[PDB]
Design a protein around this ligand. Structure first.
Ligand SMILES: CCC(C#N)(CC)Nc1nc(NC)nc(-n2cncn2)n1
Ligand SMILES: [Mg+2]
Ligand SMILES: [Zn+2]
Length: 324
């Protein structure tokens, strides 16, 4: 088992590490397992003076706060987004661009970004007058909640993985994590993409092909988009992995649609299992959301995302060919 897990972790720094296999070989603790691996790999425990005890205590508690009975927004998804963010941070076009604190913040944001997800959408929470929608005035309702839970868990006994950060680093990391988790709210997608396109249109690059990100606004705009890209990365993975993600999201969608139907509500797009095409839903998702984003990211970091973008396009056309 340990040999199988070690073999899978040979792909720790690669797009398309098989996180499903990691879950299997870690007795369904993919988030704790992959986060420990990532933090060891980047020397983050040493740099930020985090004991293994504190880190594994926090991570196990965080993972326990992902719901195992939701089909998609469980800790496997979190583990995938964290590992994908870890890969994106090391894209050669971003060499030496981000600080250690920014790296830490992004990976942490990815790990916590869907914690305590109920397996329904923001629109569902708003339209059912949820306590969470009330608390956050319908504004990034889930994403605010994920932040609330992920941060509060830091206050549990032996859980404050940021204890040895400086005061300013703690404040700045909090702000950055907030920015990156809120950037996973799909209501912010068009704004984020507009800003990414602006950065591409005005990009500055060194002689070595590395992006120049002078001011803090540009830096956080790239990091926000990076975590959003990782969140939206399933269609950019090898087809055998993408198909497993699609199976999981459609299970979660159909379950929400059943709740909507039983409440006498209008069923959300793609959530009616008696009429929904899984394949049409994926092609629309890619055409309207994922491909505009990832093509723009690819342009920002060219040529480093070329195989990722080609895989996305190939998967899109494969799904389109499977439409009934
Ligand atoms: C906020 C992220 C979210 C979005 N959008 C919803 C959880 N991610 C997501 N991931 C997949 N993976 C196959 N598919 C979809 N689909 C969205 N329409 C059809 N599919 N969405
Ligand atoms: Mg989310
Ligand atoms: Zn997510």
């Amino acid at each position: 088992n340990e040999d199988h897990l070690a073999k899978e972790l040979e792909d720790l720094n690669k797009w398309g590490l098989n996180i499903f296999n990691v879950a299997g070989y870690s007795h369904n603790r993919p988030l704790t397992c992959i986060m420990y691996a990532i933090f060891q790999e980047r020397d983050l425990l040493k740099t930020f003076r985090i004991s293994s005890d504190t880190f594994i205590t926090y991570m196990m508690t965080l993972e326990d706060h992902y719901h195992s009975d939701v089909a998609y927004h469980n800790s496997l998804h979190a583990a995938d987004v964290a590992q994908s963010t870890h890969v994106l941070l090391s894209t050669p076009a971003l060499d030496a661009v981000f600080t250690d604190l920014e790296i830490l913040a992004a990976i942490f944001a990815a790990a916590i970004h869907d914690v305590d997800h109920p397996g329904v959408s923001n629109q569902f929470l708003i339209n059912t007058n949820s306590e969470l929608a009330l608390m956050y005035n319908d504004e990034s309702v889930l994403e605010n909640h994920h932040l609330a839970v992920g941060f509060k868990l830091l206050q549990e006994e032996h859980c404050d993985i940021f204890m040895n950060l400086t005061k300013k680093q703690r404040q700045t990391l909090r702000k950055m994590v907030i920015d990156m988790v809120l950037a996973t709210d799909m209501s912010k997608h068009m704004s984020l993409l507009a800003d990414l396109k602006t950065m591409v249109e005005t990009k500055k690059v060194t002689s070595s092909g590395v992006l120049l990100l002078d001011n803090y606004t540009d830096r956080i705009q790239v990091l926000r988009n990076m975590v959003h890209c990782a969140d939206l990365s399933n269609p950019t993975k090898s087809l055998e992995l993408y198909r497993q993600w699609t199976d999981r999201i459609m299970e979660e969608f159909f379950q929400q649609g059943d709740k909507e139907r039983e409440r006498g509500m209008e069923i959300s797009p793609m959530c009616d299992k008696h009429t929904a095409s899984v394949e049409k839903s994926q092609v629309g998702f890619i055409d309207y959301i994922v491909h505009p984003l990832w093509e723009t990211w690819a342009d920002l970091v060219q040529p480093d995302a070329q195989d990722i973008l080609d895989t996305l396009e190939d998967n899109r056309n494969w799904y389109q060919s499977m439409i009934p």
